[PDB]
Amino acid sequence: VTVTFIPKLTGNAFFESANKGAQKYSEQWGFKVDYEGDANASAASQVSVINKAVQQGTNAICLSSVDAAGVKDALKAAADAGVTVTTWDSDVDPSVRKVMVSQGTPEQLGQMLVQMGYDSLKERGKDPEKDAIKYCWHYSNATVTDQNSWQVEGEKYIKSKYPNWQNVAPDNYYSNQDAEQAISVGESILSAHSDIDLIICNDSTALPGQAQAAQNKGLTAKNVTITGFASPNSMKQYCNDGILTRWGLWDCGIQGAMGCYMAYYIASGNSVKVGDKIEIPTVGTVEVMPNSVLDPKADDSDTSSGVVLLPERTIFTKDNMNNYDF
Numbered sequence: 001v002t003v004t005f006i007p008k009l010t011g012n013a014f015f016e017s018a019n020k021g022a023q024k025y026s027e028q029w030g031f032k033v034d035y036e037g038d039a040n041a042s043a044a045s046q047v048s049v050i051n052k053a054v055q056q057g058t059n060a061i062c063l064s065s066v067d068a069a070g071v072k073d074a075l076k077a078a079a080d081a082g083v084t085v086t087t088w089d090s091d092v093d094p095s096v097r098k099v100m101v102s103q104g105t106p107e108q109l110g111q112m113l114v115q116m117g118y119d120s121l122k123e124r125g126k127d128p129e130k131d132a133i134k135y136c137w138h139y140s141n142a143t144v145t146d147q148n149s150w151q152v153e154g155e156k157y158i159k160s161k162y163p164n165w166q167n168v169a170p171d172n173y174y175s176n177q178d179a180e181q182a183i184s185v186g187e188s189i190l191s192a193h194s195d196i197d198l199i200i201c202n203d204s205t206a207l208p209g210q211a212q213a214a215q216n217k218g219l220t221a222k223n224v225t226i227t228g229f230a231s232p233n234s235m236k237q238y239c240n241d242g243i244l245t246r247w248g249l250w251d252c253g254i255q256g257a258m259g260c261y262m263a264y265y266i267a268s269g270n271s272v273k274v275g276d277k278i279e280i281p282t283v284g285t286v287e288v289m290p291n292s293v294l295d296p297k298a299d300d301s302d303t304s305s306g307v308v309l310l311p312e313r314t315i316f317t318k319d320n321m322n323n324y325d326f
């Protein structure tokens with residue numbers, strides 16, 4: 001069996017680390033993972049990668065989507081060619097994939113982002129419980145499924161728990177997963193909103209780009225609070241240089257491996273339904289959940305379509321970041 005493992009883009013540390021995990025585990029499990037993507041985060045590029053993998057006779061795809069709508073037709077065609085379709089990281093329409101391996105619910109992840117920001121704000125001498133904290137979100141793009149679901153839940157949480165906070169840029173800032181653009185956009189936020197208190201960077205490119213922008217402006221964690229999601233090796237130097245205090249992620253290597261395992265398990269002829277408990281060798285037992293764990297409006301009618309959730313997420317600071325190497 002070959003699983004084609006497709007990232008939102010290659011050459012970003014989150015996706016490279018996820019593939020390192022998929023490669024390590026699939027070698028032990030006895031199947032091939034073909035890592036295929038593009039340097040740009042582009043739905044049209046992902047369609048081309050999907051089509052080429054189908055044409056080459058891949059048995060399965062495990063995809064993290066930059067835009068669900070833009071890959072729907074290609075994934076329907078993949079399934080009609082006999083290819084098992086799964087997702088990880090950022091989902092698509094659940095009617096066109098079997099299992100999604102997700103890092104957490106949008107409520108969990110949106111609240112985690114806000115809580116990291118709250119903690120870092122308090123540590124630089126603000127009173128986030130009461131202050132009119134000025135903030136905004138900086139991430140990849142306005143349509144991707146994962147990051148927008150977190151923004152929606154994080155905004156609901158802020159408006160409920162911290163009504164005094166002020167979103168100074170409600171349209172959000174977008175840097176398209178382009179490393180150089182994330183720096184430039186990070187600089188734009190700090191120039192146009194120079195008194196901003198918190199920038200929530202729920203994207204693995206926006207977070208290091210925003211930290212670099214702050215460093216370019218001579219700022220440290222004492223001036224402005226930046227938090228978000230990124231693999232820890234990409235942020236250690238910024239943290240050692242005092243640019244930010246705290247950010248988060250989860251075990252993206254095991255996540256990529258799990259997504260590829262689910263694709264292999266189904267492509268090998270095993271049926272998977274919501275409620276099943278599946279023993280993934282050397283990882284543990286997972287439970288397939290209904291699609292509505294990621295969106296309460298999701299249709300749960302098809303029990304062959306479901307979600308596996310990672311059991312934990314990770315908050316990094318200078319005190320634990322050196323325990324990790326990805």
Ligand SMILES: C[C@@]1(O)OC[C@H](O)C1(O)O
Nearest residue numbers: 014089146202203204229
């Ligand atoms: C790590 C992350 O926030 O940035 C890129 C990934 O797709 C992600 O999980 O959204």
